[PDB]
Amino acid sequence: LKRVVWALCFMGSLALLALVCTNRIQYYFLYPHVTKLDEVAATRLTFPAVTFCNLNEFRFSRVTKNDLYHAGELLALLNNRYEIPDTQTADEKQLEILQDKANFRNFKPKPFNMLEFYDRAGHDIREMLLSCFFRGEQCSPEDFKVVFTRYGKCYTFNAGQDGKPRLITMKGGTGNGLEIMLDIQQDEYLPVWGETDETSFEAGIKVQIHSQDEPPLIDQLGFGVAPGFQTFVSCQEQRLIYLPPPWGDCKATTGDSEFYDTYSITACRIDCETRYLVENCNCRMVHMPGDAPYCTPEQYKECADPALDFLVEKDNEYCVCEMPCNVTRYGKELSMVKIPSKASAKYLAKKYNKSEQYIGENILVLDIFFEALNYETIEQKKAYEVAGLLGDIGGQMGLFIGASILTVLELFDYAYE
Amino acid sequence: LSLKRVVWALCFMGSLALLALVCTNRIQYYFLYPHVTKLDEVAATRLTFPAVTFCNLNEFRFSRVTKNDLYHAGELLALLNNRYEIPDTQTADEKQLEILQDKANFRNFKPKPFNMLEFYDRAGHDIREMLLSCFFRGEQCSPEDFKVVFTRYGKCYTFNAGQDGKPRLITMKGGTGNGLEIMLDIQQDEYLPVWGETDETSFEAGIKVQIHSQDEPPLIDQLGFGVAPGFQTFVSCQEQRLIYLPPPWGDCKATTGDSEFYDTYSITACRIDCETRYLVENCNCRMVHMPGDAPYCTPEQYKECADPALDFLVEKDNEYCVCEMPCNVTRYGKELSMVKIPSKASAKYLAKKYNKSEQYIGENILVLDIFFEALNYETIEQKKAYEVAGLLGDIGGQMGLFIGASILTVLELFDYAY
Amino acid sequence: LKRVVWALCFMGSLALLALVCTNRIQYYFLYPHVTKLDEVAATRLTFPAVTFCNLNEFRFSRVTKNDLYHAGELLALLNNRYEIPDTQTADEKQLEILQDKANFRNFKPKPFNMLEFYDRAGHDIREMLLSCFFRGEQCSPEDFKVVFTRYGKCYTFNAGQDGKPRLITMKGGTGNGLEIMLDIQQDEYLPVWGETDETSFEAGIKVQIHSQDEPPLIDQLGFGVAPGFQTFVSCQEQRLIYLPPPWGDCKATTGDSEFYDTYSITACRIDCETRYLVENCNCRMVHMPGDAPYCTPEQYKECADPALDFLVEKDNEYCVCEMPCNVTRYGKELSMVKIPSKASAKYLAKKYNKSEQYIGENILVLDIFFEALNYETIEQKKAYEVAGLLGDIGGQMGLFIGASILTVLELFDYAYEVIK
Ligand SMILES: OC[C@H]1O[C@H](O[C@H]2[C@H](O)[C@@H](O)[C@@H](O)O[C@@H]2CO)[C@H](O)[C@@H](O)[C@@H]1O
Ligand SMILES: OC[C@H]1O[C@H](O[C@H]2[C@H](O)[C@@H](O)[C@@H](O)O[C@@H]2CO)[C@H](O)[C@@H](O)[C@@H]1O
Ligand SMILES: OC[C@H]1O[C@H](O[C@H]2[C@H](O)[C@@H](O)[C@@H](O)O[C@@H]2CO)[C@H](O)[C@@H](O)[C@@H]1O
Ligand SMILES: *[C@@H]1O[C@H](CO)[C@@H](O)[C@H](O)[C@H]1NC(C)=O
Ligand SMILES: *[C@@H]1O[C@H](CO)[C@@H](O)[C@H](O)[C@H]1NC(C)=O
Ligand SMILES: *[C@@H]1O[C@H](CO)[C@@H](O)[C@H](O)[C@H]1NC(C)=O
Ligand SMILES: *[C@@H]1O[C@H](CO)[C@@H](O)[C@H](O)[C@H]1NC(C)=O
Ligand SMILES: *[C@@H]1O[C@H](CO)[C@@H](O)[C@H](O)[C@H]1NC(C)=O
Ligand SMILES: *[C@@H]1O[C@H](CO)[C@@H](O)[C@H](O)[C@H]1NC(C)=O
Ligand SMILES: [Cl-]
Ligand SMILES: [Cl-]
Ligand SMILES: [Cl-]
C-alpha cells in the first residue's frame, strides 16, 4: 500500500535538523567568551625589566654657568632676569658657590641642549650603585641600560638585548631575585627654591617593574623607595589575554613599529603624547621617541610641561587607548626594615667614606623577587567555537543522514528498475 | 535474519532509557541551583573616583581643651586622676604642663554644660589647618571639598563624599596624574600629652585613611590603613566590583533590606547599625559617631559603658553583631610605597613657606597620593549556571535525538510490526 | 557491481557516528579542567600562624669567650687568626669588652655547638615582647613557640597543636586580629665589621604569616617590619585547590611524613636542602630536621652557607618541587604610622624604663588582621567526567554498536556469494 509514514518521517528528520542548526547557529553568533583563571608556581619564569630613577633630576656639582643661564629659570634657580631670586635657602656655602655660578657679567652663552643636559647632569649609575646581585651573581653598572624618562636619566636592569640568554627565576624568595644597594646622593640634590615640574620635595627613587617589551611610564606608574630602609618587593606575574571583536574589544599591532614593536597601553600613551606635543609645541621632550627637535628650556616652561601635564592629569579625550590583547601585570607586596642598624652604621660609613648620619639619609637596599605562586593567568577564551558548533549539530545531522541512507537502501531496486 | 528486528528494537529502548537518564540528571542538576563566577580585569574609562576619608591619630588639639573640658573629660583622657589634685607629669613641651596645671585648678570653678559631640567638633583637628595643598587631576581642591564625618577617632574628613553638589569625579588613565594628591601637617605640637592608656589616646603619630564607595560609610578605626609623617605615600589602586546571588543560588542580602540608618546595605552599615542598637540598649546612649537620635554618651558613660561595649563588639563578639553578605560589594585593591619628605635640599624651602623649623617639617608633613593603575577595574560576578531556558534547551535537544533515532526504527520496523 | 552504493551507506553511516563519538571522546582524554573562583566574608575563619625573627642573630651580652673563639670568624668579629682587626672599627665601649673577651692567652677551647649557641644567645621573647593582644585578650611569651630558622632563634604565634581551642576571626579589622609591641633591642646587636651570611646591615624583624601545617622559610619569603613604626597588615586568606594527574601536576600528602605531616612547597624545599647539605657537607644547619650532626661554625663558613646559598640563589635543577594539591596563600596590604609621637614618648620611656631615644629606635607595633572579604577560594574542578561524556555521545556510540552488529550481520549473509 501507500505509506505516507515514510515521507512524514523524512520531513520530521529534516525539521529536527533545521531547528538544531538554527538554535546552535544563533548561539554561535552571540560570540560568547569565558575567562579562564589559574594561579600556579611556574618554572623558568622570565624575570622582568626593572627601571629606576633618582627623584633628583640634576646633580648640583654638574650644573655649569651655561646650564644655569639657559635652564636656571626652569629649575627655579634664577628669576626671569637671570638673577638669583629672593629665595636664598642655603645658609651653607651652597649659595655662595651658586652666586659665583650665576655671575653672567661678560659671560658668552654657549650652545645648550636639554637632552645633553640630562645626560651630563643626571645621576650616574656608577656612583649610585654600591652593590648589585641577581641570583647569586654580581651585576655591575654595565648591566643597566640608560633610559630617559620624565625624571631625566634613569636606568633599567634586564632590559633585554645584551647576552645573558634571558634571565629567569625558578624558586620563590629573595634568593632568586635582584638585590641592589644604592646611594641616592642628597649631597648632589639641586637646591629647591620653588615648585616646578622638574622640582622635587622628596628624596629617594622611583621604580617600575615591567615586561621587557613595554616601555616605562615611571613618573605616572612607578612606586617609591625611601632612603634609610631595605625594601622587600614580593611579586607575582599576572598574564592577561583578551579577545578582539566580535568576542571582545582588544587590539594588537604587528611587527611594524611606529615607535614601539609591541602594542601596550604605555606604548600607546607615549606615542599619543609625542604627537600631541609635536603638533602643539613643535618639539618633543627628551624622553619622547621620534626625530622632532627637542624642546628648549623655554619651550618646556611655556608649552611642553603644561601640555604633558594636561594629558596625564586633565585630558579625557585626546589620548585614550584601546585595551591590548596581551598584558603582563606584576602584583606587588612591599615591606621594609631600617638601614643601617646602630651596630652597622660605622662599618658602612667607613666602607663608603661617609659620615654615619649620611648613610642613614642616603643608603637604601632594594630586593625584588617573586613569591612561590609566581604566576597567574587570566585569559578570555572563545566559549563556542566551530568544533563546538559542528559537534552540537553533528548528532542530529547523523540521524538525518541515516534516514536518507535508509531511504536509499529502500529504493535501490525500484530506482534501478 | 530476525536479529535485524531486535537490533532496531533495542536501539529504540536504549534511546528511550538515555532520554530518561539524561533529562532526569539535568533537572536534578538544575535543582542544585549552581552558579558560575565570571571574572574580568580591564582598563575602564569614566571610572568613578572613590570617597577618601582620613583622620588625625590625635583626637583633641591641646590648645582647644578648656577648663570645662578638662573638668568633664579629664578622667577619660587620662589627664586627671581626680578633680582635686594638680597634674605633675613632665611634658615634651615644658609649657604644656604649666597650662595644664592652671586649667586643672577647679577651686571655685562652676561646671558648665558639656557635650562630647561639641567637644570633638570644636577640639578636633581642623582641615583648614592640616591641609597644606590639595590637587585632583590637575585641579586645586580646598578644605571645602572635604566633608566633616565623625568616626571613633573623632572629627575626620571625607574627600569626594558625593553627599552635596553633583559633579561626579572620574578617572580615565592610570597613574598619579589622574588621582588625588594632598599634603598635610599632622600638627604634633597640638597632640595631647599621653599619660595613660585609653581608647581615646594614641602612642602613634600620623593619620588613618580609608578608601571606600560613596554609598558605604567608613569604619576607619577597624579597616583604615595608616600613613606616616615624613613620607610621601603612593597608593596605587584597582576597583573590584563583586556581585553575589541571593539565597537560592547564593546567600547574599539585597542592598535594600529595609534601610535603617543608611539607604544602601553594606557590611559596614550593618555593623554600625548593630553597634548603635547594642549601645543604646546597654548604655542608654550612643557614641558621637553613631546615627539615630539617642542621647550622646557623656565622658562618664564613654569610660564606664560605651568604650567597653564597643571594644567587646569589635574584638570579642562572635554572635551579637554578625552581618550577611551584601549582594553588591566594592573592594579597592591597594599597593602602597613611599619616599622621604623633605629632602635636605627642600627642607629649608618648606620650613620657610609654612613658618616652621626644618625639624618640624620632618616630623609633621606628609604627602599622600591616591590613584589607579592602568588595569583599574576588575569584576567578579556570580551568575546562574543553569537557568530554566537552559534546561528546556537541553531537554529539547535530547528529545530531538530521541525522535531522530526512533524514526530510524519506525522506518525499519514498519513492515514487520505493522 | 552497483553494490557499492550499498557498501558506502554502511561505511558512511559508521563514519559519521564514529566522528561524532571521537570528537567528545578525544576531548575527554585531554582531561580538561575549570577553575572556580569565589571571594566572600567567611565566618569563624582559622587565624594563621605568625612567625617572626629579630634581624640580629646573637645578643652581644650573651657571647662568651668560647663562643667568640669558635664563631668569631663566622660573625666577622675575628680574622682567620683569631684576632680583632684594627681597633678603630666599633664603639670603644664594646671594643674593650670584646678585646677582653677575645683575649685567648693560653685559652683552652671547650666544646661548642651552634644549636646551643643560637638557643642561648638568640633574642629572648620574654624581653622583646612588651605587649601582646589577640582579639581583646592578652597573650604572653608562653603563647609563642620557639622555631629555629636561618635567622636563628625565632618565634611563632598560634603555631597550633598547643592543646588550646582554635583561634578564629569573625569580623574585618584590627579588633579581630593580633597586635604586638616589640623591643628589637639594638643595644644587644652584635657589632658588624664585615659581610657574612650571619651579619645584618638592617635593624627590625622579619615576619611570615603562614598556615599552621606549613613550616616557615622566613629568610626567603618573609616580609620586613621596621622599628619606630606601627605597621598594619590587612590580610585575605586564599585557598587554592589543584587536581592531580591526568588533570593536573599536583601531588597530595600521600605516603609517610619523611619530615612533615603535610606536603607544601616549603616542606619540600627544606627536605631537599637538608639532603643536599648532608651529602656535600656531611652536616645540617641548625634549622634543618633529621639527625645528622650539626655543622660547626667552620663548616658553616666553608661548606654550609655556600651550599645553601647555591640552592636558594643559583640552583635550577637539584631542588625542584612539585605543586601541592592544597595551598593557602595570604594576600596582604601593609601600611604604617610613626611611633612614638612626641606626646607619647615620655610615657613609653617611663613605662618600659628606657630613654626616649631608645624607644624611637627600638619599639615597633605590629597589627595582623583580616579585611571584611577575608576568604578567597580558587579550585580546579574536572571539566568533563565520564557521566558527562556518556550524556553527550551515549546515544551515538550506542547506535554505532547496533550499526556495527547490523553490519557484521549484513556482510555475513552476503557470504552467501561463496556458494556461487
Ligand atoms: O578547540 C575547541 C574544541 O576542542 C574539541 O574539539 C576537538 C576534537 O575533540 C578533536 O578530536 C579534534 O577534532 O580537534 C577538535 C578541535 O578542532 C572539543 O570537543 C570541542 O567541543 C571544542 O569546541
Ligand atoms: O548528539 C550528540 C551531541 O550532543 C550534544 O549536543 C546537544 C547540544 O549540547 C544541545 O544544546 C542541543 O542542541 O542538542 C544537541 C544534540 O542534538 C553535545 O553537546 C555534542 O557535543 C554531541 O555531539
Ligand atoms: O551531578 C553534578 C553534575 O551534573 C551535570 O552532569 C550531568 C550531565 O549533564 C547529564 O547529562 C548526565 O550525564 O548526568 C550528569 C550527572 O551525573 C553537570 O553537567 C555537571 O557539571 C555536574 O558536575
Ligand atoms: C603575550 O606576550 C608575551 C610576551 O610578553 C608572550 O610570551 C606570550 O606568548 C604572549 N601571549 C599570547 C598568546 O599572545
Ligand atoms: C673621603 O672623603 C674625604 C672628604 O670628602 C676626602 O677628602 C677623601 O679624599 C676621601 N677618601 C678617599 C680615599 O676617597
Ligand atoms: C546590585 O547589583 C545589581 C547588578 O549589577 C545592580 O544593578 C544594582 O544597582 C546593585 N545595587 C542596587 C540594588 O542598586
Ligand atoms: C611665624 O614666623 C614669624 C616671623 O616670620 C614669627 O614672628 C611668628 O611667631 C611665627 N609663628 C609662630 C607664633 O610660631
Ligand atoms: C586543604 O588543607 C587544609 C589544611 O591546611 C585543610 O584544612 C582543608 O580541608 C584542605 N582542603 C581540601 C579540599 O583538601
Ligand atoms: C631601669 O634601667 C636601669 C638602667 O638600665 C636599671 O639599673 C634598673 O634596674 C631598671 N629598673 C628596673 C626596676 O628594672
Ligand atoms: Cl596620556
Ligand atoms: Cl561590630
Ligand atoms: Cl631550595
mmCIF file of C-alpha atoms in Angstrom, chain A residues 6-221:
data_model
loop_
_atom_site.group_PDB
_atom_site.id
_atom_site.type_symbol
_atom_site.label_atom_id
_atom_site.label_comp_id
_atom_site.label_asym_id
_atom_site.label_seq_id
_atom_site.Cartn_x
_atom_site.Cartn_y
_atom_site.Cartn_z
ATOM 1 C CA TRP A 6 7.908 7.378 5.371
ATOM 2 C CA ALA A 7 7.585 10.798 3.731
ATOM 3 C CA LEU A 8 6.387 12.184 7.056
ATOM 4 C CA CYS A 9 9.336 10.761 8.995
ATOM 5 C CA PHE A 10 11.809 12.048 6.414
ATOM 6 C CA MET A 11 10.354 15.544 6.755
ATOM 7 C CA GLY A 12 10.485 15.390 10.532
ATOM 8 C CA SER A 13 14.110 14.257 10.491
ATOM 9 C CA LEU A 14 14.880 17.287 8.321
ATOM 10 C CA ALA A 15 12.743 19.517 10.533
ATOM 11 C CA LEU A 16 14.601 18.464 13.681
ATOM 12 C CA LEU A 17 17.869 19.205 11.890
ATOM 13 C CA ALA A 18 16.598 22.649 10.902
ATOM 14 C CA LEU A 19 15.742 23.573 14.488
ATOM 15 C CA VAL A 20 19.023 22.290 15.934
ATOM 16 C CA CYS A 21 21.005 24.182 13.290
ATOM 17 C CA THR A 22 19.062 27.405 13.818
ATOM 18 C CA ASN A 23 19.424 27.228 17.598
ATOM 19 C CA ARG A 24 23.114 26.291 17.654
ATOM 20 C CA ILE A 25 23.977 28.758 14.898
ATOM 21 C CA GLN A 26 22.225 31.587 16.749
ATOM 22 C CA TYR A 27 24.167 30.901 19.940
ATOM 23 C CA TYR A 28 27.398 30.890 17.938
ATOM 24 C CA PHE A 29 26.733 34.380 16.608
ATOM 25 C CA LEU A 30 26.488 35.640 20.183
ATOM 26 C CA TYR A 31 30.254 35.087 20.178
ATOM 27 C CA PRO A 32 30.349 34.267 23.908
ATOM 28 C CA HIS A 33 33.577 34.003 25.877
ATOM 29 C CA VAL A 34 34.780 32.567 29.165
ATOM 30 C CA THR A 35 37.640 33.881 31.269
ATOM 31 C CA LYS A 36 39.940 31.118 32.459
ATOM 32 C CA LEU A 37 41.911 31.643 35.651
ATOM 33 C CA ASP A 38 44.826 29.698 37.124
ATOM 34 C CA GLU A 39 47.418 30.565 39.748
ATOM 35 C CA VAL A 40 50.464 28.322 39.935
ATOM 36 C CA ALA A 41 54.177 28.096 40.600
ATOM 37 C CA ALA A 42 55.738 28.278 37.154
ATOM 38 C CA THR A 43 59.302 27.257 36.375
ATOM 39 C CA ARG A 44 61.745 29.172 34.163
ATOM 40 C CA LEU A 45 59.669 32.324 34.715
ATOM 41 C CA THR A 46 61.153 35.268 32.794
ATOM 42 C CA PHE A 47 62.414 37.978 35.149
ATOM 43 C CA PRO A 48 61.058 41.425 34.201
ATOM 44 C CA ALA A 49 62.836 44.679 33.437
ATOM 45 C CA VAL A 50 63.316 46.982 36.433
ATOM 46 C CA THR A 51 63.633 50.715 35.816
ATOM 47 C CA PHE A 52 64.588 53.232 38.476
ATOM 48 C CA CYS A 53 65.175 56.968 38.697
ATOM 49 C CA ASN A 54 66.600 59.263 41.344
ATOM 50 C CA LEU A 55 63.927 61.801 42.363
ATOM 51 C CA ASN A 56 66.598 64.456 41.880
ATOM 52 C CA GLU A 57 66.996 65.239 38.169
ATOM 53 C CA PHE A 58 70.242 67.249 38.047
ATOM 54 C CA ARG A 59 73.386 66.885 40.168
ATOM 55 C CA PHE A 60 74.382 70.168 41.767
ATOM 56 C CA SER A 61 78.091 69.692 41.013
ATOM 57 C CA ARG A 62 77.339 69.162 37.310
ATOM 58 C CA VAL A 63 75.301 72.335 36.764
ATOM 59 C CA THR A 64 77.542 74.839 34.975
ATOM 60 C CA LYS A 65 77.333 78.580 34.442
ATOM 61 C CA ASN A 66 75.975 77.955 30.937
ATOM 62 C CA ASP A 67 73.404 75.432 32.209
ATOM 63 C CA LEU A 68 72.186 77.953 34.776
ATOM 64 C CA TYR A 69 71.886 80.672 32.136
ATOM 65 C CA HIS A 70 69.716 78.504 29.863
ATOM 66 C CA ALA A 71 67.744 76.356 32.310
ATOM 67 C CA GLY A 72 68.060 78.296 35.556
ATOM 68 C CA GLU A 73 64.545 79.681 35.288
ATOM 69 C CA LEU A 74 63.126 76.236 34.556
ATOM 70 C CA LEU A 75 64.823 74.921 37.716
ATOM 71 C CA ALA A 76 63.703 77.916 39.800
ATOM 72 C CA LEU A 77 67.342 78.829 40.473
ATOM 73 C CA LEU A 78 67.108 82.148 38.612
ATOM 74 C CA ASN A 79 64.269 84.638 38.148
ATOM 75 C CA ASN A 80 63.024 85.989 34.803
ATOM 76 C CA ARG A 81 66.029 88.324 34.800
ATOM 77 C CA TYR A 82 68.975 85.917 35.074
ATOM 78 C CA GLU A 83 69.435 86.661 38.777
ATOM 79 C CA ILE A 84 69.297 84.586 41.948
ATOM 80 C CA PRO A 85 65.791 85.087 43.476
ATOM 81 C CA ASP A 86 64.850 86.393 46.919
ATOM 82 C CA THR A 87 64.726 82.701 47.794
ATOM 83 C CA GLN A 88 68.106 82.024 49.390
ATOM 84 C CA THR A 89 67.580 78.806 51.338
ATOM 85 C CA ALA A 90 71.235 77.791 51.624
ATOM 86 C CA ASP A 91 72.929 79.198 54.730
ATOM 87 C CA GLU A 92 75.743 76.913 53.583
ATOM 88 C CA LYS A 93 78.486 77.613 51.053
ATOM 89 C CA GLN A 94 75.964 76.338 48.519
ATOM 90 C CA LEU A 95 74.504 79.801 47.956
ATOM 91 C CA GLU A 96 77.978 81.311 47.785
ATOM 92 C CA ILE A 97 79.044 78.917 45.029
ATOM 93 C CA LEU A 98 75.716 79.449 43.290
ATOM 94 C CA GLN A 99 76.197 83.220 43.169
ATOM 95 C CA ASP A 100 79.607 82.774 41.530
ATOM 96 C CA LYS A 101 77.933 80.400 39.090
ATOM 97 C CA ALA A 102 75.209 82.978 38.420
ATOM 98 C CA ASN A 103 77.693 85.756 37.647
ATOM 99 C CA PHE A 104 76.961 86.436 33.974
ATOM 100 C CA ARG A 105 78.909 89.686 33.602
ATOM 101 C CA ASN A 106 80.711 89.480 30.260
ATOM 102 C CA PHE A 107 79.600 85.848 30.018
ATOM 103 C CA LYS A 108 79.254 84.490 26.493
ATOM 104 C CA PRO A 109 76.472 81.878 26.154
ATOM 105 C CA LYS A 110 77.471 78.542 24.599
ATOM 106 C CA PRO A 111 75.238 76.004 22.817
ATOM 107 C CA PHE A 112 72.775 74.215 25.105
ATOM 108 C CA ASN A 113 70.595 71.118 24.650
ATOM 109 C CA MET A 114 68.191 69.641 27.231
ATOM 110 C CA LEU A 115 68.947 66.017 26.346
ATOM 111 C CA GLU A 116 72.677 66.635 26.654
ATOM 112 C CA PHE A 117 71.993 68.430 29.955
ATOM 113 C CA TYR A 118 70.044 65.472 31.382
ATOM 114 C CA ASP A 119 72.670 63.026 30.140
ATOM 115 C CA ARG A 120 75.519 65.053 31.647
ATOM 116 C CA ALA A 121 73.964 66.297 34.901
ATOM 117 C CA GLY A 122 71.716 63.331 35.701
ATOM 118 C CA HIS A 123 72.819 60.960 38.455
ATOM 119 C CA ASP A 124 75.429 58.392 37.406
ATOM 120 C CA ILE A 125 74.626 54.703 37.959
ATOM 121 C CA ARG A 126 78.355 54.143 38.506
ATOM 122 C CA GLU A 127 78.175 56.333 41.605
ATOM 123 C CA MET A 128 74.704 55.375 42.833
ATOM 124 C CA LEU A 129 75.127 51.600 42.601
ATOM 125 C CA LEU A 130 77.038 50.424 45.656
ATOM 126 C CA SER A 131 76.269 46.748 45.051
ATOM 127 C CA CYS A 132 74.106 44.604 42.798
ATOM 128 C CA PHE A 133 73.363 40.877 42.819
ATOM 129 C CA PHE A 134 70.950 38.747 40.819
ATOM 130 C CA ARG A 135 70.566 35.092 41.765
ATOM 131 C CA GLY A 136 73.951 34.926 43.457
ATOM 132 C CA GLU A 137 75.767 36.623 40.570
ATOM 133 C CA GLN A 138 77.281 40.086 40.870
ATOM 134 C CA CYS A 139 75.963 42.711 38.443
ATOM 135 C CA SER A 140 77.674 45.982 37.534
ATOM 136 C CA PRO A 141 76.720 49.413 36.142
ATOM 137 C CA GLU A 142 77.043 47.868 32.674
ATOM 138 C CA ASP A 143 74.063 45.610 33.335
ATOM 139 C CA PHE A 144 71.924 48.749 33.383
ATOM 140 C CA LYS A 145 70.625 50.340 30.195
ATOM 141 C CA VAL A 146 70.287 54.131 30.182
ATOM 142 C CA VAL A 147 66.719 55.253 29.541
ATOM 143 C CA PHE A 148 65.365 58.802 29.572
ATOM 144 C CA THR A 149 62.027 59.370 31.326
ATOM 145 C CA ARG A 150 60.301 62.454 32.650
ATOM 146 C CA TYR A 151 62.665 62.211 35.648
ATOM 147 C CA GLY A 152 65.583 62.506 33.270
ATOM 148 C CA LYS A 153 68.416 59.985 33.165
ATOM 149 C CA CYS A 154 67.195 56.666 34.582
ATOM 150 C CA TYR A 155 68.345 53.067 34.414
ATOM 151 C CA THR A 156 66.854 49.700 33.512
ATOM 152 C CA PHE A 157 68.059 46.345 34.797
ATOM 153 C CA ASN A 158 67.476 43.375 32.499
ATOM 154 C CA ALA A 159 66.141 45.478 29.627
ATOM 155 C CA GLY A 160 66.878 42.532 27.342
ATOM 156 C CA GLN A 161 69.312 42.906 24.439
ATOM 157 C CA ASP A 162 72.700 42.035 25.933
ATOM 158 C CA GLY A 163 74.000 38.486 26.265
ATOM 159 C CA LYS A 164 72.768 36.621 29.361
ATOM 160 C CA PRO A 165 70.253 34.487 27.376
ATOM 161 C CA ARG A 166 67.123 35.686 29.171
ATOM 162 C CA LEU A 167 67.287 35.944 32.967
ATOM 163 C CA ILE A 168 64.940 33.502 34.683
ATOM 164 C CA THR A 169 63.675 32.751 38.186
ATOM 165 C CA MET A 170 62.974 29.228 39.456
ATOM 166 C CA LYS A 171 62.088 29.468 43.151
ATOM 167 C CA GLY A 172 60.228 31.799 45.480
ATOM 168 C CA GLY A 173 62.139 34.194 47.700
ATOM 169 C CA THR A 174 64.801 36.879 47.746
ATOM 170 C CA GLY A 175 67.475 34.402 46.679
ATOM 171 C CA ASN A 176 66.087 34.036 43.158
ATOM 172 C CA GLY A 177 65.750 37.775 42.702
ATOM 173 C CA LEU A 178 67.539 41.079 42.428
ATOM 174 C CA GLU A 179 69.194 42.934 45.288
ATOM 175 C CA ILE A 180 70.706 46.382 44.904
ATOM 176 C CA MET A 181 72.196 48.870 47.330
ATOM 177 C CA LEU A 182 72.035 52.484 46.195
ATOM 178 C CA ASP A 183 73.340 55.836 47.410
ATOM 179 C CA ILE A 184 70.801 58.494 46.387
ATOM 180 C CA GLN A 185 73.398 61.253 46.900
ATOM 181 C CA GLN A 186 71.415 64.002 48.613
ATOM 182 C CA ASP A 187 74.662 65.988 48.770
ATOM 183 C CA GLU A 188 74.175 66.350 45.000
ATOM 184 C CA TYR A 189 70.495 67.311 45.156
ATOM 185 C CA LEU A 190 69.663 70.608 43.477
ATOM 186 C CA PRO A 191 68.511 73.266 45.961
ATOM 187 C CA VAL A 192 64.744 73.668 45.821
ATOM 188 C CA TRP A 193 63.666 77.311 45.897
ATOM 189 C CA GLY A 194 60.277 76.892 44.247
ATOM 190 C CA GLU A 195 57.727 74.488 42.808
ATOM 191 C CA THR A 196 58.038 73.330 39.204
ATOM 192 C CA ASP A 197 57.528 70.080 37.302
ATOM 193 C CA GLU A 198 61.271 69.422 37.496
ATOM 194 C CA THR A 199 61.417 70.263 41.223
ATOM 195 C CA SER A 200 61.015 67.645 43.974
ATOM 196 C CA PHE A 201 60.260 67.947 47.701
ATOM 197 C CA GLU A 202 61.149 64.283 48.143
ATOM 198 C CA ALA A 203 64.302 62.172 48.467
ATOM 199 C CA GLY A 204 64.561 58.593 47.258
ATOM 200 C CA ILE A 205 63.973 56.813 43.951
ATOM 201 C CA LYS A 206 61.006 55.887 41.782
ATOM 202 C CA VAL A 207 60.869 52.308 40.470
ATOM 203 C CA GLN A 208 58.819 50.460 37.867
ATOM 204 C CA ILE A 209 58.783 46.698 37.249
ATOM 205 C CA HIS A 210 57.628 45.935 33.707
ATOM 206 C CA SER A 211 57.804 43.500 30.810
ATOM 207 C CA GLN A 212 60.824 43.964 28.530
ATOM 208 C CA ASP A 213 58.526 44.669 25.578
ATOM 209 C CA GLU A 214 56.838 47.571 27.358
ATOM 210 C CA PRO A 215 58.428 50.983 27.874
ATOM 211 C CA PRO A 216 58.279 52.568 31.350
ATOM 212 C CA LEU A 217 55.935 55.412 32.362
ATOM 213 C CA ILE A 218 57.610 55.732 35.735
ATOM 214 C CA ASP A 219 56.502 59.270 36.654
ATOM 215 C CA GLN A 220 52.898 58.053 36.464
ATOM 216 C CA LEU A 221 53.039 54.336 37.290
#
